Chains A and B, each alone.
Chain A
Amino acid sequence: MGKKLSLIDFNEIYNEENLITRANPIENHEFSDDGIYSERIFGSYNEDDDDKDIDTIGWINIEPYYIINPILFTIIKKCIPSINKIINYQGEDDYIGLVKFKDNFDDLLEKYTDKKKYQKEYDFLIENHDKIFINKLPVFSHKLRPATLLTGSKGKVLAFDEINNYYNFVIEYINQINEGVVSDDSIDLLLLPLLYNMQFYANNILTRIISEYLRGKKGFLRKNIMGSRINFSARNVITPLIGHPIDEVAMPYKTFAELYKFQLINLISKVKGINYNEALKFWEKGILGFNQELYNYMEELITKTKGGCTFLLNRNPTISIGSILYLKIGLIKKDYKDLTLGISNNLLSALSGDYDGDVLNIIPVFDNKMKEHFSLLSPQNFLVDRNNGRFNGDFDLQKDQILGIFILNN
């Protein structure tokens, strides 16, 4: 649908090793090595032996007959309106046949063209003469097309995608034509109906891939652009903290435990000389209710961690300098119920938030390299207004603080 990108010559990529010529998915009560659902060529996620990613693609050989390139069918259709009629057997060359069309394609393309409307399409067909005819059809990995296991009374249920039903069908049509070497005696070519339906089936398979792109394949990539779902993330309400530096904040017990769960378990396993599974059991107990022991490990972690224990605090919309700020975890709260982040009042103006019950997003940073790079967003670095180079009033004393200093000096 109006997309321009490089085309692929399947013969160059064709591999005899990854060849799917068997339409039966199962052989002798096990997944067929040559079948459409083949553990041999695509692999199995459970066993490590597969060593094969989804990128693995199977191959099919349609020789000695060629089919129209599925992606280019609409472009050919606009140039040649009789393509649908010609391929089937029932203008002057109406219903000649696919093989006859293949031999006479250059004559037919010149015969059926719009001088003004389809000149651009005709030039593209001249550019891609080699890619018009397709001898090899790709079949994507069975890992992508799942078969959900279910029990059936007649037989164990095989779940298939709407496309998967088509896949086994497509292989069957070509299989019969090749088996016969001398059988046809030239008396009657019935191969054209088998090839004809196949073109539509592959085209609908191509349309299904478009629907598969709609079904969470390219869309999920667009979901990341719309919103990448970051694990190791938290949200907390903001409450004022006094008595700690501007960069340091107070983080709740539950927030730190989950965000630093894997960091915490490493310490617990080493200190008690216990297995990680056993260490997880202690972490589960601490999350349920406040225990001094887990608080002590967390207190040691924030004090001794290299680069400090730091995170990113963003108030959305993130439209201004200082909307995301690099901050430090100064203290961990000892009240399980208290789930409010303690921030300095000076940070508030840059963030643009208020202590009205709104929540700010917490993105912890772990790698020491990232901490230094993200420290360029720290409050101290933003003390200088980037517009003027002057001091930033957002980080200055606020209403309550100004009054005390004013009473002191004036």
Chain B
Amino acid sequence: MDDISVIKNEDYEGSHRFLAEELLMPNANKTDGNRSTMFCSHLAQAVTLQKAEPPLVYTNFENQVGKYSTAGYRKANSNYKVIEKIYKNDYNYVLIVQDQETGEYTLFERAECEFLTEHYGFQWDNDKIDSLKKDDTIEKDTVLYKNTCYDENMNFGYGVNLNAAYFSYKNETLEDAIVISESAAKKLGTFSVNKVKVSVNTNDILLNLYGDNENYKGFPDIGEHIKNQIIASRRRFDYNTALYELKNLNEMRDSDTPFFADGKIVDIEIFSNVPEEELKVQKYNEQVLYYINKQKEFSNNVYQKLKKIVEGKDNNVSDKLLHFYNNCKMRIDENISYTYQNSKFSGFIMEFTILEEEPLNKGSKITGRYGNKGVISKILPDDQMPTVAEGRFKGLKADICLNPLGVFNRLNPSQLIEQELNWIAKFIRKDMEEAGSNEEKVSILLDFLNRVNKEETELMEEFINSLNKTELEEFLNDIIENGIPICQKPFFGNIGLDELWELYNHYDHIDYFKCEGISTPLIIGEIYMVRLKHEPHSKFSARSTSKSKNFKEHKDLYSKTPVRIGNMEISNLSLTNEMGSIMDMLNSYSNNETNRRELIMQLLTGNPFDTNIDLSDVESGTSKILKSLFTCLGLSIDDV
């Protein structure tokens, strides 16, 4: 409404309720609304990072975001005891447990990867669930398997902290551009999981791409990475009677449909509507048969282990376990016809789950929590990055260098405060290491924290005095080397210009670093950085004469969707005032079929470094079809 008088600040003082996603943003009062809404979008666009860390400057709600986002970790909801463990694959297995109080029987599934959509997914740390053994009790709130975001005590991290300096690196950091050290780029690593379905009909066969003559392997094995970016190639046959081109079976052809992806396959699921005898008799199914049998063995075992539980009088079984048992029993039972898309399918359908560690590449977008945006223009060696020399902090290398121009225009001042806070914190850390006893070190720590956040100081003193001296020494060394925890709440509890002023004036020794080849003094401080979903691969297109529906189904390596030329483009080309050449390009590339065939032939038969094309003047195929139809109508163009 026109009146904003309804809002009274005293009511919301000390309360962060009006913030939602901005609860993950430090110093949110200083950041503009536009940057904040961009940050809210970026959080959804963020991708999981292998080496994610808890932020050095944190709002203290991040861990809560990890707890209430159930997609990343599995927590038991009751006390359980491990009844048994059954394996389908080395990577994937199921664990049968019984509630120690209720008596209900439940199951947990272990796999390395989680598929989200498209290529997006994340790996699982299955250390605890693999550690669990038969006759081992599972406590109430234990975390069986977790995402890389969570740490040993389940603290939540959506990004990595990188040393940042605002510096103009050969003008490469122009507008929203970033230059990164190779190690830092190693820190920004994402997982990609892809589920690819290969459908083989009765007369279709899979080529022996991955196997020798004695052993037929048409697709990678459970532990093997893809080679040449081809999972498998399918050859469709009209009848399959002859099987005469056995030498062509090993070879590959243009007619054969190839499926493209990269990574290590971690699970294969085969759905078969073909009689076992047909698979056994023909050698090309041997690999498939083996995996099919493996599934069957697993299925049979679970039935044998759990039949008494399911049909027994107690029948204290969870619905999840019941449905899993019923599905396995359906598999072992005969006359089971599998259907895909509401139709019975010939042959068999195979689903591959493929996991690849994807590194940071040029054109990828990484950003901070304050609405700033950045594109990775160049990845450079660590030595080439600004390195301060001849100081106590000698050899400090900048992980990322950001554009200095326009920082104030962006209206996101808080990023500078994070950088500067970590820089002064670097000074405090070196001061603690340099001199004093453990008591002096904790005293310096408490002084700095009281300057930043008093509540953090009080809780930190509680934690410090609670720790025994050995634990205190370990905590002190961790603070000196790994980093310093600083708490900056989003709206209430943040520091300001005056507080930073006090921090700089009291610690008079703190001044800018003079780097090796840089005349201007620089500030190098850790900034939290997150990786966004956007990558150059998504929008890449390439076309050569011969929409890419194959690329979406993984049958083409990259999209071949053609670019479209329109009236605006034709006018901009007509600026040249050589309409004939524009028509030549249009007809040779698109409109005229004969001219396009001639262009391909001339390009392949002509001089390699000299290209001069002569194109015949002929009516287009569209023109021929139009002339035929109009004469049938009885109408012809006159005075063309």
Spell out A's residues near B (CB within 8 Å): 3, 5-8, 10, 13, 53-57, 69-71, 131, 138-141, 144, 206, 209, 212-213, 217-218, 220-221, 224-237, 239-240, 242, 254-255, 258-259, 261-263, 265-267, 270, 276, 285, 287-289, 301, 304-306, 314, 316-319, 321, 323-324, 335, 337-340, 345, 354-357, 359, 361-363, 365-370, 373-374, 376-377, 398-401, 403-404
Whole-angstrom distance between the Cβ of A285 and the nearest chain B Cβ: 8
Q: How far is the CA of A369 from the CA of B637 in the complex (A)?
A: 33
Which segment of B158-166, B297-305, B576-584 sits at the interface? B576-584
Q: How far is the CA of A225 from the CA of B565 in the complex (A)?
A: 8
Residues on A with C-beta less than 8 A from B375 are: 239, 355-357
Q: Chain B CB within 10 Å — which of A56, A138, A233 has the most? A: A233
Residues on A with C-beta less than 8 A from B557 are: 287-288
Whole-angstrom distance between the Cβ of B606 and the nearest chain A Cβ: 7
Residue from the list A71, A218, A254, A404 in contact with B634, Cβ < 8 A = A71
Residue from the list A131, A228, A305 in contact with B611, Cβ < 8 A = A305
Chain B residues 538-556 with CB under 8 Å of chain A are 539-545
CB pair A323 B572 closer than 8 Å: yes
Whole-angstrom distance between the Cβ of A141 and the nearest chain B Cβ: 6
Residue from the list B403, B543, B572, B609 in contact with A258, Cβ < 8 A = B543
Whole-angstrom distance between the Cβ of A226 and the nearest chain B Cβ: 7
Among residues of B, the one whose C-beta sits closest to the C-beta of A202 is B632
Residues on B with C-beta less than 8 A from A365 are: 585
Provided the pairs A289-B229, A339-B536 are in contact, do residues A263 and B564 lie with their beta carbons within 8 angstroms?
no
CB pair B634 A141 closer than 8 Å: no
**What are 8 pairs between A and B in contact, CB < 8 Å?**
A141-B628, A228-B591, A232-B544, A263-B604, A337-B361, A359-B539, A363-B565, A400-B171
Which segment of B346-354, B394-402, B461-469, B618-626 sits at the interface? B618-626
> Does B363 sit at the interface, judged by CB under 8 A?
yes
Given contacts A209-B633, A234-B542, A242-B172, list 7 more A-B pairs with CB under 8 A. Answer: A57-B631, A206-B633, A229-B562, A230-B564, A254-B540, A323-B572, A345-B171
> Does B617 sit at the interface, judged by CB under 8 A?
no
Residues on A with C-beta less than 8 A from B172 are: 240, 242
Mask: chain B, 367-380; 1 = CB below 8 Å from A; 0 = not: 00000010101000
Number of B residues near A (Cβ < 8 Å) is 88
CB pair B632 A138 closer than 8 Å: yes
Residue from the list B609, B612, B635 in contact with A301, Cβ < 8 A = B609
Residue from the list B576, B603, B638 in contact with A377, Cβ < 8 A = B576
> Does B516 sit at the interface, judged by CB under 8 A?
no
Residue from the list A56, A304, A319, A338 in contact with B363, Cβ < 8 A = A338
Residues on B with C-beta less than 8 A from A53 are: 624
Residues on A with C-beta less than 8 A from B16 are: none
Provided the pairs A213-B629, A319-B568, A373-B581 are in contact, do residues A224 and B591 lie with their beta carbons within 8 angstroms?
yes
Whole-angstrom distance between the Cβ of B563 and the nearest chain A Cβ: 4
Residues on B with C-beta less than 8 A from A6 are: 635-638
Among residues of A, the one whose C-beta sits closest to the C-beta of B540 is A339
Residues on A with C-beta less than 8 A from B625 are: 54, 144, 217
CB pair A217 B544 closer than 8 Å: no
Q: How far is the CA of A301 from the CA of B202 in the complex (A)?
A: 47
CB pair B541 A234 closer than 8 Å: yes
> Does B608 sit at the interface, judged by CB under 8 A?
yes
Residues on A with C-beta less than 8 A from B584 are: 367, 370
Q: How far is the CA of A325 from the CA of B177 in the complex (A)?
A: 23
Residue from the list B361, B542, B565, B613 in contact with A230, Cβ < 8 A = B565
Whole-angstrom distance between the Cβ of B155 and the nearest chain A Cβ: 32
Residues on A with C-beta less than 8 A from B565 are: 227-228, 230, 363
Residues on A with C-beta less than 8 A from B75 are: none
A-B contacts, CB under 8 A, total: 292
Q: How far is the CA of A306 from the CA of B611 in the complex (A)?
A: 7
> Does B480 sit at the interface, judged by CB under 8 A?
no
Among residues of B, the one whose C-beta sits closest to the C-beta of A354 is B175
CB pair A10 B634 closer than 8 Å: yes
CB pair B629 A140 closer than 8 Å: yes
Residues on B with C-beta less than 8 A from A276 are: 604
Q: How far is the CA of A119 from the CA of B560 in the complex (A)?
A: 56
> Does B87 sit at the interface, judged by CB under 8 A?
no
Residue from the list A10, A242, A305, A337 in contact with B170, Cβ < 8 A = A242
Residue from the list B170, B175, B534 in contact with A357, Cβ < 8 A = B534
CB pair A368 B171 closer than 8 Å: no
Whole-angstrom distance between the Cβ of A113 and the nearest chain B Cβ: 24
Residues on A with C-beta less than 8 A from B562 are: 229-231, 233
Residues on A with C-beta less than 8 A from B77 are: none
Q: How far is the CA of A364 from the CA of B85 in the complex (A)?
A: 60
Provided the pairs A55-B627, A228-B565, A376-B576 are in contact, do residues A8 and B361 lie with their beta carbons within 8 angstroms?
no
Spell out B's residues near A (CB within 8 Å): 168, 170-177, 228-230, 359, 361-363, 365, 373, 375, 377, 403, 405-406, 534, 536-537, 539-545, 557-558, 560, 562-569, 571-573, 575-578, 581, 584-586, 589-591, 596, 599-600, 603-606, 608-613, 619, 621-622, 624-629, 631-638
CB pair A335 B362 closer than 8 Å: yes
Residues on A with C-beta less than 8 A from B572 are: 314, 318, 321, 323-324, 377
Residue from the list A13, A270, A289, A369 in contact with B228, Cβ < 8 A = A289
Residues on A with C-beta less than 8 A from B541 are: 233-236, 359
Whole-angstrom distance between the Cβ of B430 and the nearest chain A Cβ: 33
Q: How far is the CA of A285 from the CA of B568 in the complex (A)?
A: 39
Whole-angstrom distance between the Cβ of A392 and the nearest chain B Cβ: 15
Whole-angstrom distance between the Cβ of B173 and the nearest chain A Cβ: 8
Residues on A with C-beta less than 8 A from B168 are: 400, 403-404
Among residues of B, the one whose C-beta sits closest to the C-beta of A54 is B624
Q: How far is the CA of A212 from the CA of B630 in the complex (A)?
A: 11
CB pair A255 B635 closer than 8 Å: no
CB pair A234 B563 closer than 8 Å: yes
CB pair A370 B589 closer than 8 Å: no
Provided the pairs A324-B569, A345-B174 are in contact, do residues A266 and B605 lie with their beta carbons within 8 angstroms?
yes
Residues on A with C-beta less than 8 A from B571 are: 318
CB pair B634 A338 closer than 8 Å: no
Provided the pairs A7-B635, A288-B557, A370-B585 are in contact, do residues A339 and B537 lie with their beta carbons within 8 angstroms?
yes
Residue from the list A217, A240, A263, A319 in contact with B377, Cβ < 8 A = A240
Q: How far is the CA of A368 from the CA of B610 in the complex (A)?
A: 8
A-B pairs, 8 with minimum CB distance: A227-B564, A235-B541, A233-B563, A258-B542, A231-B545, A262-B603, A340-B363, A6-B638
CB pair A5 B581 closer than 8 Å: no
Residues on B with C-beta less than 8 A from A404 are: 168, 171
Residues on A with C-beta less than 8 A from B619 are: 55
CB pair B581 A240 closer than 8 Å: no
Whole-angstrom distance between the Cβ of A318 and the nearest chain B Cβ: 4
Residues on A with C-beta less than 8 A from B373 are: 356
CB pair B612 A368 closer than 8 Å: yes
Residue from the list B171, B568, B635 in contact with A318, Cβ < 8 A = B568
CB pair A355 B176 closer than 8 Å: yes
Provided the pairs A261-B544, A361-B563 are in contact, do residues A217 and B629 lie with their beta carbons within 8 angstroms?
yes
Whole-angstrom distance between the Cβ of B560 and the nearest chain A Cβ: 8
Whole-angstrom distance between the Cβ of A161 and the nearest chain B Cβ: 13
CB pair A71 B633 closer than 8 Å: yes
Residue from the list A71, A212, A301, A361 in contact with B608, Cβ < 8 A = A301
Q: How far is the CA of A255 from the CA of B543 in the complex (A)?
A: 9
Among residues of A, the one whose C-beta sits closest to the C-beta of B170 is A242
Q: How far is the CA of A401 from the CA of B403 in the complex (A)?
A: 12
Residue from the list A71, A209, A255, A306 in contact with B629, Cβ < 8 A = A209
Residues on A with C-beta less than 8 A from B585 are: 230, 363, 365, 370
Residues on B with C-beta less than 8 A from A233 are: 541, 543, 562-563, 589
CB pair A231 B544 closer than 8 Å: yes
CB pair A7 B362 closer than 8 Å: no
Residues on A with C-beta less than 8 A from B174 are: 240, 345, 355, 398-400
Provided the pairs A227-B565, A376-B576 are in contact, do residues A217 and B537 lie with their beta carbons within 8 angstroms?
no
CB pair B596 A231 closer than 8 Å: yes
Provided the pairs A340-B536, A355-B175, A366-B613 are in contact, do residues A224 and B590 lie with their beta carbons within 8 angstroms?
yes
